[PDB]
C-alpha cells in the first residue's frame, strides 16, 4: 500500500493586536508526529509520536527554524491577501496550507501536492505534474504569475520527489512497529428494542487503524441504505478510530440483515449476522 507524509498549517490574523495565531501539524498517514503552536511557550517544534524522538537535537533545531520561517511567510500572506480582496484591517482572516508526498508499494515517489486556501476557499494549488498551478480566482492569478516567474514549482518538485520521500521512508522504518502495523477493527453488534415490534441493530467497528473503512448493511444479501444511520469516522483518542452503522428492523427479522466490514487490516471483508 501507499504511505503519505503531510503537513497542515493554519494562520489566523488577530486584527485587535499582535501576530497571527499559527498552528502546524505533521502526519505520517493517519498518525500525527509533530506540532508547532505559536501560542505555546516552548517556541519549538514538538514530538507527538515516540518514533520521531529517535531524531537528535539537530532535527528539532532545523525543523523549528523552518516552521518559524513558515509562520512569518503566512503573516506576510495575510497582509497581502487583505489587500488583494480589499478587506479592512479590522476583521480576522484565515490562511491554510497543506503539502506532502506519497510513496507507493514500491517505496518510490508516487505523488506530490501543495494546496493553499484563503478564508476557507481554494486559492492556489500545485497541479499533479508538479510543474504548474491552478488559480481559483483572479487574485490567485497574481500569485500564480509571481510563483511561475520565481520557479517555485521547480523548487517544490525537487523537494517532493527528493527530501520529502527520503524522509517519509526514514520515518516509516523508524516507526515501523506502529506506522506499518494495521489494526483490524474489533467488531460487534448491539440490539435495542424501540418497541414491541421493531429493533435497532448497530454494527460497531472499534480500535482500527488506518481510518479508511467501509461499513454497510445488507438485507437478504442486497445493499440496504434506507432506514440506516452511519456516523462519520471519529478518533478514539489513543491513535485509533471508530465507526458505527445502524438499521431499524422488524422484531424477529434480525437474521435477514448482515453487516459488512471492509478494512486493510482484514485478510478479507467480514460479514456479521446477529
Amino acid at each position: 500500500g501507499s504511505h503519505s507524509m503531510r503537513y497542515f498549517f493554519t494562520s489566523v490574523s488577530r486584527p485587535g493586536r499582535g501576530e497571527p495565531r499559527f498552528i502546524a501539524v505533521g502526519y505520517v498517514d493517519d498518525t500525527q508526529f509533530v506540532r508547532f503552536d505559536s501560542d505555546a511557550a516552548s517556541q519549538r517544534m514538538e514530538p507527538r509520536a515516540p518514533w520521531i524522538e529517535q531524531e537528535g537535537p539537530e532535527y528539532w533545531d532545523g525543523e523549528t527554524r523552518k516552521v518559524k520561517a513558515h509562520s512569518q511567510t503566512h503573516r506576510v500572506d495575510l497582509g497581502t491577501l487583505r489587500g488583494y480582496y480589499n478587506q479592512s484591517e479590522a476583521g480576522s482572516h484565515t490562511v491554510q496550507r497543506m503539502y506532502g508526498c506519497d510513496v507507493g508499494s514500491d517505496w518510490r515517489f508516487l505523488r506530490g501536492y501543495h494546496q493553499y486556501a484563503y478564508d476557507g476557499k481554494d486559492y492556489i494549488a500545485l497541479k499533479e505534474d508538479l510543474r504548474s498551478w491552478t488559480a481559483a480566482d483572479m487574485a490567485a492569478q497574481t500569485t500564480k504569475h509571481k510563483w511561475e516567474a520565481a520557479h517555485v514549482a521547480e523548487q517544490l518538485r525537487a523537494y517532493l520527489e527528493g527530501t520529502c520521500v527520503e524522509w517519509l521512508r526514514r520515518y516509516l522504518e523508524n516507526g515501523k512497529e506502529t506506522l506499518q502495523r494495521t489494526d483490524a477493527p474489533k467488531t460487534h453488534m448491539t440490539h435495542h428494542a424501540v418497541s414491541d415490534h421493531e429493533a435497532t441493530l448497530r454494527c460497531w467497528a472499534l480500535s482500527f487503524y488506518p481510518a479508511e473503512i467501509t461499513l454497510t448493511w445488507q438485507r437478504d444479501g442486497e445493499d440496504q441504505t434506507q432506514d440506516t444511520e452511519l456516523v462519520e469516522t471519529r478518533p478514539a483518542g489513543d491513535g485509533t478510530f471508530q465507526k458505527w452503522v445502524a438499521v431499524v428492523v422488524p422484531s424477529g427479522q434480525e437474521q435477514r440483515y448482515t453487516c459488512h466490514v471492509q478494512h486493510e487490516g482484514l485478510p478479507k471483508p467480514l460479514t456479521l449476522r446477529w
Binding site: 503537513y7 505533521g26 525543523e63 523552518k66 516552521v67 520561517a69 513558515h70 511567510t73 506576510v76 500572506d77 497581502t80 491577501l81 496550507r97 503539502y99 493553499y116 486559492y123 492556489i124 497574481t142 500569485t143 509571481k146 510563483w147 520565481a150 517555485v152 523548487q155 517544490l156 523537494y159 527530501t163 520529502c164 527520503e166 524522509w167
Partner: peptide, 9 residues
C-alpha cells in the same frame, strides 16, 4: 522534514 517555505503569495 519540512520544506523551506519562503515564497509569499
Amino acid at each position: 522534514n519540512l520544506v523551506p517555505m519562503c515564497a509569499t503569495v
